């Protein structure tokens, strides 16, 4: 259980980092129209982002949907999801 949770969390962190960098690079040139080299996008830090390299980057469009829970008892879940949904 600990190994699975740790690897899942690492994959999520890497995915969030790459999507944030991609979104920043998307926003920058879109308004500035400049070509600040090609940045560096850490695709290789995880197999998940590595396999999805073509879909994430280049010309593409992406959208993440996040579910919430209305129960008060599950507060620690909902807020946590928000902290991941705020990313990028």
């Amino acid at each position: 259980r600990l190994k699975e949770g740790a690897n899942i969390n690492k994959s999520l962190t890497t995915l969030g980092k790459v999507i944030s960098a991609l979104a920043e690079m998307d926003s920058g040139p879109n308004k500035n129209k400049k070509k600040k080299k090609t940045d560096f996008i850490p695709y290789r830090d995880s197999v998940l982002t590595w396999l999805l390299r073509e879909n994430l980057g280049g010309n593409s469009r992406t959208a993440m949907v996040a579910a919430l829970s209305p129960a008060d008892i599950n507060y620690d879940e909902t807020l946590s999801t928000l902290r991941y949904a705020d990313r990028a």
Binding site: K3, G28, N32, K34, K36, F40, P42, R44, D45
Partner: protein, 433 residues
């Protein structure tokens, strides 16, 4: 109880391992026959890091020697410390790889890897609380590179949560001894970048420079280079064996030195180094050790730090010394050379102190840098690799052993991506858009 399993593959790995066991046995006062005759009582306190106990109050190292040619094993056994090793850990075959990475990885090594893994697992199961592994090999060679990478892959498959170090001797531009260095180096780095927690960059050019210009040796040989390397390896894991004011485990070094998973290539160094007759002319103090550690010529990697920025550095001092001097010196080094340290880390100097120095010295220090300049090394290999891969200079010798042209391309792309990743944190600002 932290315990380390040592593996040594190939000629270079076996020679460095023999010298390393000589050094460690001297430090712990172990006779060549395996008995103990030391004086200080603290030598047996943590002797189980490297040695198993044997019934006659003897000690046997955890070394595991591997080679596809039996000559190096015969040389090691017929030596000053040959009898110390267990006879069952000498795993070897015949018809060596012959400088062919494919033979070492796919054809020949695939049959001996099972026996090597059996011995490694046997040593692992008897360890009270295993910490990690060590490997010594040469990337530019035959059996060493391929079998080391294969063993690293297998072990990381079996023991994912354990530390894995690697003291790898990488090729040099000027001092080249084999004509197929670039292919072997590329295909080895392609595996090391993925399946290793820490890698130490060593090359014979820097060690020859140290011998010529610091020790002033007229005719250095491989023994002296192995001596310097062994001093470094003994320095790295000192805090596991002896007490200290501020301890530093291997995992502490990994955590503090590695900001991102793929940047774990380090530049080692050792101080003090003096040329015999000059010894009386220079005092031994913490400022002198700090000055020698950060000197550009003391690095054992042939990469000038001045062409890049230090992502991190770690220093492990050995000897009775004041903490104020160490902290003040590291802060001063950070402040004065402000342009050679990355800006977005507030303090990138790890410090550790151990009370017990080496046998014949009052103080010593080991230095482990992590700087962007290492990319230069990889770039040089790439600068050669394509120059041979474009025309397929010696490619058939590989493709006759099961391999494929695509795999070379993946190795090249992975090394190029690593070089770019190191290169991004290398310019001294990012303001313009």
């Amino acid at each position: 109880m932290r315990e380390i399993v040592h593996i040594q593959a190939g000629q270079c790995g076996n020679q460095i391992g023999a010298k390393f066991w000589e050094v460690i046995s001297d430090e712990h006062g172990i006779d060549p026959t395996g008995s103990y005759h030391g004086d200080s009582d603290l030598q047996l306190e943590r002797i189980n890091v490297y040695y198993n106990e044997a019934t006659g109050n003897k000690y046997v190292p955890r070394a595991i020697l591997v080679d596809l040619e039996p000559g190096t094993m015969d040389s090691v056994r017929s030596g000053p410390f040959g009898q110390i090793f267990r006879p069952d850990n000498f795993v070897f075959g015949q018809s060596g790889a012959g400088n062919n990475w494919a033979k070492g990885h796919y054809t020949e090594g695939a049959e001996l890897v099972d026996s090597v893994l059996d011995v490694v697992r046997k040593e692992s199961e008897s360890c009270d609380c295993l910490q990690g592994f060590q490997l010594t090999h040469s990337l530019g060679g035959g059996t060493g590179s391929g079998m080391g990478t294969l063993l690293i892959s297998k072990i990381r498959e079996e023991y994912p949560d354990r530390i894995m170090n690697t003291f790898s001797v990488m090729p040099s531009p000027k001092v080249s001894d084999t004509v197929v260095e670039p292919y072997n180096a590329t295909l080895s780095v392609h595996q090391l970048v993925e399946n290793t927690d820490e890698t130490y960059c060593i090359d014979n050019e820097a060690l020859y420079d140290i011998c010529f210009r610091t020790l002033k040796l007229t005719t250095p040989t491989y023994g002296d280079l192995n001596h310097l390397v062994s001093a470094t390896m003994s320095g790295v894991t000192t805090c596991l064996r002896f007490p200290g004011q501020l301890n530093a485990d291997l995992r502490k070094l990994a955590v503090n030195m590695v900001p991102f998973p793929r940047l774990h290539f380090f530049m080692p160094g050792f101080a003090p180094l003096t040329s015999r007759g000059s010894q009386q002319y220079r005092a031994l103090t913490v400022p002198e050790l700090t000055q020698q550690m950060f000197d550009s010529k003391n690095m054992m990697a042939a990469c000038d730090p001045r062409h890049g920025r230090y992502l991190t550095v770690a220093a492990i001092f050995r000897g009775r010394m004041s903490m104020k001097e160490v902290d003040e010196q590291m802060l001063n080094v950070q402040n004065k050379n402000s342009s050679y340290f990355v800006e977005w880390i507030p303090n990138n100097v790890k410090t550790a102190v151990c009370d017990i120095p080496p046998r014949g010295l009052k103080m010593s220090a080991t230095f482990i840098g992590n700087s962007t300049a290492i990319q230069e090394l990889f770039k040089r290999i790439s600068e050669q690799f394509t120059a041979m891969f474009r025309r397929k200079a010696f490619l058939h010798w590989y493709t006759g052993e099961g391999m494929d042209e695509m795999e070379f391309t993946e190795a090249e792309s992975n090394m190029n991506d690593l070089v770019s990743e190191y290169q991004q944190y290398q310019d001294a600002t990012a303001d313009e858009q």
